[PDB]
Amino acid sequence: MRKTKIVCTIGPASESEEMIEKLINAGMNVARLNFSHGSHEEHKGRIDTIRKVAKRLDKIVAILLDTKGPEIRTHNMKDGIIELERGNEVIVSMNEVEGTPEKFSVTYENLINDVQVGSYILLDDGLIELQVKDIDHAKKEVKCDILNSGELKNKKGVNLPGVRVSLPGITEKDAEDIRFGIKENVDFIAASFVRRPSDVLEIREILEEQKANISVFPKIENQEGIDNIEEILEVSDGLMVARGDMGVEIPPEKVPMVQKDLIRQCNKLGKPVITATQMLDSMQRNPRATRAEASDVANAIYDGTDAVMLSGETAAGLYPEEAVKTMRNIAVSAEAAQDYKKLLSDRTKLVETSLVNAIGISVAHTALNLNVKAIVAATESGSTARTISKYRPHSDIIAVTPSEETARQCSIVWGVQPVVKKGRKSTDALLNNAVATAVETGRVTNGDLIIITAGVPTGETGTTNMMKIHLVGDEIANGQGIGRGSVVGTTLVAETVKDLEGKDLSDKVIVTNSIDETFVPYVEKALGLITEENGITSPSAIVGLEKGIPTVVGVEKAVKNISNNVLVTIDAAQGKIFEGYAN
Amino acid sequence: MRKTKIVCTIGPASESEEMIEKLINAGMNVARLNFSHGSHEEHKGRIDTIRKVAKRLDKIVAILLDTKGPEIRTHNMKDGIIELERGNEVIVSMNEVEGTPEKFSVTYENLINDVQVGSYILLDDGLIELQVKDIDHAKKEVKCDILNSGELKNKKGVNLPGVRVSLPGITEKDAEDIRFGIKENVDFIAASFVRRPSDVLEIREILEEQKANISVFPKIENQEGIDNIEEILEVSDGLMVARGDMGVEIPPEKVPMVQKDLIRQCNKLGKPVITATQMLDSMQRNPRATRAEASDVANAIYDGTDAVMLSGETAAGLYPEEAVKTMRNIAVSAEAAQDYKKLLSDRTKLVETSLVNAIGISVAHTALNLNVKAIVAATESGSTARTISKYRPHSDIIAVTPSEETARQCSIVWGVQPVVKKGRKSTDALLNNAVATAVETGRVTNGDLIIITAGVPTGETGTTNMMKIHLVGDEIANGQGIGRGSVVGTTLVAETVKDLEGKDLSDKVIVTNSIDETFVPYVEKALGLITEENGITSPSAIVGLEKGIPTVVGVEKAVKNISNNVLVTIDAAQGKIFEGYAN
Amino acid sequence: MRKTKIVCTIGPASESEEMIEKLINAGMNVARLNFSHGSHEEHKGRIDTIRKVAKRLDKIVAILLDTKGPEIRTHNMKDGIIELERGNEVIVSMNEVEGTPEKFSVTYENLINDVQVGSYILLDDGLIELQVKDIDHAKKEVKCDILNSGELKNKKGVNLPGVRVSLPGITEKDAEDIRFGIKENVDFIAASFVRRPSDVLEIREILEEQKANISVFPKIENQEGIDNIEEILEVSDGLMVARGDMGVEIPPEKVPMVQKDLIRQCNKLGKPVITATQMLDSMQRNPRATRAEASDVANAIYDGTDAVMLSGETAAGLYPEEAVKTMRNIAVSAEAAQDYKKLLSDRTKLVETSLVNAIGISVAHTALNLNVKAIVAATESGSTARTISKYRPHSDIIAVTPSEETARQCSIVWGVQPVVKKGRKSTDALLNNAVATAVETGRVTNGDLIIITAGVPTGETGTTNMMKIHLVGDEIANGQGIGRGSVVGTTLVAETVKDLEGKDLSDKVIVTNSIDETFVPYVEKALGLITEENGITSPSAIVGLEKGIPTVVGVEKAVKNISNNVLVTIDAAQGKIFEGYAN
Numbered sequence A, B, C: 001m002r003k004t005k006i007v008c009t010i011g012p013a014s015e016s017e018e019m020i021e022k023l024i025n026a027g028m029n030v031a032r033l034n035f036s037h038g039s040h041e042e043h044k045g046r047i048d049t050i051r052k053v054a055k056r057l058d059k060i061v062a063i064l065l066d067t068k069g070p071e072i073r074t075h076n077m078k079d080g081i082i083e084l085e086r087g088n089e090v091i092v093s094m095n096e097v098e099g100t101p102e103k104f105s106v107t108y109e110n111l112i113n114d115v116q117v118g119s120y121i122l123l124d125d126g127l128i129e130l131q132v133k134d135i136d137h138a139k140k141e142v143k144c145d146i147l148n149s150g151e152l153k154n155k156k157g158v159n160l161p162g163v164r165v166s167l168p169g170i171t172e173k174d175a176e177d178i179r180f181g182i183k184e185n186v187d188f189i190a191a192s193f194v195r196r197p198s199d200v201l202e203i204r205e206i207l208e209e210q211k212a213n214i215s216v217f218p219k220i221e222n223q224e225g226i227d228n229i230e231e232i233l234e235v236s237d238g239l240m241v242a243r244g245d246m247g248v249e250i251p252p253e254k255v256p257m258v259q260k261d262l263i264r265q266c267n268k269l270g271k272p273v274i275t276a277t278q279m280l281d282s283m284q285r286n287p288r289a290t291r292a293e294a295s296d297v298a299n300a301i302y303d304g305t306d307a308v309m310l311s312g313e314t315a316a317g318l319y320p321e322e323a324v325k326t327m328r329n330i331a332v333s334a335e336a337a338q339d340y341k342k343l344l345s346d347r348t349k350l351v352e353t354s355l356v357n358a359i360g361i362s363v364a365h366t367a368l369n370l371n372v373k374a375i376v377a378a379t380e381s382g383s384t385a386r387t388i389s390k391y392r393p394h395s396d397i398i399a400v401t402p403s404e405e406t407a408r409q410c411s412i413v414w415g416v417q418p419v420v421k422k423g424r425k426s427t428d429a430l431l432n433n434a435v436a437t438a439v440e441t442g443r444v445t446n447g448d449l450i451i452i453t454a455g456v457p458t459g460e461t462g463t464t465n466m467m468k469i470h471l472v473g474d475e476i477a478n479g480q481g482i483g484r485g486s487v488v489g490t491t492l493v494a495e496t497v498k499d500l501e502g503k504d505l506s507d508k509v510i511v512t513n514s515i516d517e518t519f520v521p522y523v524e525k526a527l528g529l530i531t532e533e534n535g536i537t538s539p540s541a542i543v544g545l546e547k548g549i550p551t552v553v554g555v556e557k558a559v560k561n562i563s564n565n566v567l568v569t570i571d572a573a574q575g576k577i578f579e580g581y582a583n
């Protein structure tokens, strides 16, 4: 019960050891470092603060590094500020020039080759939108009709609604920035402005030089990105959906259909997805979010998001803790009121049916149907945790892993609470450890059911390929079961027939030596029966079977051993008797 | 293809004949008149403007009247403005007094009997929240700890988080206001602050005095409302979900779960539901809505809403047309990308399975499975249009009705495009008119399939109870069909065997007199065969059957009559041949 | 409730007017005339006897003519009887010769060309089996190793396990025989030894010369038949499955898998199928059938057979009536204990989903789900009755037809009880007649639900294309319904509050003028409420709604008009009140 994960952006208002503790307590699962700003120095400082606080609190929190990415920008402007009339013309020059209401320059000198007549060109996050009138490569200029009017500062951004923007995958800075990440064993790289698989592989080839093992999550901010979503995930570990960045390039009437589709496309492949930006932006100034924002977050959860990001709310905002507390609260509420039967049925149709997924499916169903308290998923890499997660079961997924670092990668995937236990080689070891790891988390106790799952043998494990259903211990007494049923009830040990006369409701399991004629009238009024010694056609057995009361005969010293009044579950098949509630 | 209906609120920025035209063209289906403000005079003015513009454009637009409802308010304040410290006390007096940071009066003199110690009291739309400390009916005062601080103007509102608020169902003004509505044949009454069935019946008994026939849509703005949703709809025609009004009384973390539930509860009973307030509020100042707002609207559509309301956007906003255009666009997008198979399957489980609903179910399935272009639903009252609508089929629902006024009531229900055609008594008349009405809407043409549905005989019609599947005319030629198949293909009339020699792809249906030995080699390479005269064991029949090519023999003058090159569909069962594409 | 149809073979022990009556009463639906034996004279005699007795009892019984077909036979034998050693050789000569343990002749002089070395040749219904050793066309002889030993009479039969047996489709006698059938308006032709579509079309071309309109049911008795089952049914009206004839050519270990498949292949296409031969053969000598035979019949019914045939049992047997009585009894038993939900679900998957079948599907589901007493199917040709039949609904199918002769064709199709009512042109007429025809059969009465279905307009009817769900009359009283529910209960008209005091169980619908304070305590203890006059917010309405008791206010003179103590059904939606049980 916590399920959807929370990414937080670290900055001035959350650098302190004091605050990072409050954020981790508030429910942070991944810290984000935004390399669009700040020096390497600053970030290293925050990486230390995080790691140390994280281990002091004994909690797994990953570190995500968000590249600035390529971008198109205006060169400087004459007087620093310049204006554009609403029916006029402006020439967008590939050669650098001082700004003016006519001539006006961009850093991406190759802009002229990506646009055509009638292509739109948005300036400063869509503040004022142009449109290409004529193109003469002669002078390398683009004549443009200024559609909406407004002002224009110096080094402001430019966007070309797709349009295959022909920037490279990564800046030279981005290379510098992701090498820094390799050096600090950072867990996630969120690559900006991704639009082709090329643009992700450019990162992954840097990672493979170092044999890094960092997950790469592309950002998808434009039509080319949307269009290539399948081909990109083929080559990616997860995905971030930046609504605000996306909103600049595509109509905001159309964004939530695209969010819903990308998130669904990630669910299909078990790849985690983060929904980002514009989440609780009002909490930068206020100590409580607006209805619109709550709805917005809750709908990301319903769309099927693995995680949910905070930006300025936690980075520079006046209320960083309250933002994270409030995020968790929406998350819990939204999940609280959702139908896991529909949810499973949905995924069972959505995700492919294959050898590779066969045990995600069976586990999910088994878990729902038998009401299993926890699924414990043994992984080296995480792929078993992800496989179980994609089928969205009510049951808590516990990821037991020997890798500290593939445990931080589990911190982002949906519904997985990872723990680091030390590597078992044999299957037997793995199963037993699983059951023990589960109990020690405090979530599962004695009555509860558990599904243990992993890829075995732990060596040749490519895919997850076995499950065991396990009852968490451990029959207090046992014998020869008569009938096939079961009941939970409170005990009433009887030495005499009068030791249960004028003091009997039903709802109780009686425990005597054997059954006389004097006992038969009372046994029918009871829930269950545990007799001490006897055979299958004993008077105790024959009265239990005939009266449809699940019983166990042949139970060692049942009168002395099993306690009076304490609540008990008897399983007639098996012939076992349990401490409290069972299954 | 338009589906989710749009209500608009008329006011200063949309009174003009000029603008109301632009709104109706933008896609308005129901105009809302807000009686919380404005005189009867003003509203009558707008009612005329609407009707006249509506008929000039030959479009069905309903008129919804939104009552102000009861309310609790602060009496006037000393100096007009007053302040409240954040850890202090304030006495809320049932007796009228001048305002002060201590004593302070409300119009609902019965407030003291609804609250208890520890009940919250929100002032001015929750701007500053109090909490009841002690209650002494002696002095008829409520001592309260002022929790959040802030200011307090004169005639400002008060809310008691439920708390059975014990106001009456309707103001004396609300009575005056709904009688005005009866006088102007207004189509809908949106009753504010509804919380018990009593509060709706108070309106319906005024309507029954006049034998009015206006639909009553309660507003549900508090916990008591939510709690009594089933009992209220039992006694109501539809429902409005006012998020903003609701947000004041219940936590905005919790609102979207309630919205989703109320909308679903309305879907269950075929009652139309409007999602209202806070929709595209940014378009009061901007010519385009924000991502958050688009997502918000789209999610109402996905929750299963029949209609979607605009308030200030259209009433007082700087951009009324752009709000309605932008609302339709979101609506179309959101529906475009939704799975009608899931949607039907969902409703088939959700809505009850009964004699009354038996034909909604069958029509929905038939429509989805056979891909029917339109469902034409014949109604006197609307109940058949609603019954078909609740099962949410892809197919356009056309509501053919004799009643002009039960056609305006159809303007709000999901997916129904109503038209007024004059009453047919006999079933035959109704079916034939249906098919003709459908064609004249321009949506269905000759290839298309249609389901006609209504309650028959038109007299004893309580429920909707029959369907006919009809192909929209009208076999161009026919004969003796051989085989049981069918194909669409372009014709090639052949007089000679050489009249199809060195000029043949497949993909064509050949039309000759009869088949020789010289024809058999070419018939196998074809899609279909129409031979002129012949019997069942003719050479033309036997070669069509053996080669698995659907054919029709015995076709009158096929060579001369049916044209060359024009595309055609042949149905081997039936022995009919059709103009273009068929089924 | 009777469902699976019974064909009987007429002969010496069932020619009499006396017996044919006893057979029709026993449940005969189709009389079979076996043209393998007997003169035209004899058969004409029986055709008259049948028709006359049939119309005297006012029952629809069809006449089926079973052609002898082609066959291979031994020419005469030396001394009339001859013997064959078990390891010896026999020469099968194409030229006619006297019989001997060596040389030995067959009538099918073309046998040599159909067999090859190692092909088996069965003599006298498989009594002794040969096997081809060498073939020399030189002498036109087939040397054969005699595998099993035994004797051999004169004009005995020969079979070649497929082997494309190259006989013609029909004997010259068969032509003579089917022309006789055309002359006597016989209803069915069972064509023997069918194995290609050619063989059926040979009959249908004779029928088309006369424009006959007789249904053709091929017999399928060999591997070539089995193999071509799909292609044959394409060209056939139904099918007979002759197990005994089939058993000679293919291993009896394999026959019941083939029966099950053919029957299923017929169900797929809505074509009726008869399971024939070896049914209750022991009843030729005994007055009761054996367990094995009962099981055998019952399993045909479970395989999905439309009809079940009797041969010698009724034709020459000592117990013709008892055979038919006993056949019906098995039929009823077997159907009694079968799951129509499974059965529908099965067919819904089995039969194609098409425009042509769309209303079979919806009717079947509607019928099962609402528990409709009868489906009345209006047909000219029968195709609607067959369409409804193939989806196997519990509900009795009633076939209302203007054609006396397409009513006898309905006598064989599963679950259809046909009646001849005179042609209505308009849809209204058809619907109304339907409801009237159903009631007059005595099967449906006033409470019952009915589905009326047909192809409309009755003219352009190719396929069946509409359904109406109708409640069989006819509200005794009505008014303003409050609530939406319904209940069956016995009335208790109350003039006073004391007119229901010390004499009240629940389970009763009270009928008073209006409700006082003195009435409210008693209304809650009741099942339903019918008050005389009142409005929607009357004291009578408000107490019915609040207490969840379905009520109807505003009922004309309810106290005087609706009777006391008589059982009644009230429908709160509709505001109708019914005679007994409703829906």
Ligand SMILES: C/C(=N\NC(=O)c1cc(Br)ccc1O)c1nc2ccccc2[nH]1
Pocket (backbone or CB within 6 Å): B353, B354, B357, B358, B361, B362, B363, B365, B366, B369, B370, C353, C354, C357, C358, C359, C361, C362, C363, C365, C366, C369, C370
């Ligand atoms: C599934 C189906 N119809 N179902 C019902 O009419 C129905 C009625 C009730 Br009362 C309860 C359950 C039901 O399913 C259907 N009709 C088709 C027509 C054409 C093609 C495919 C079709 N599939």
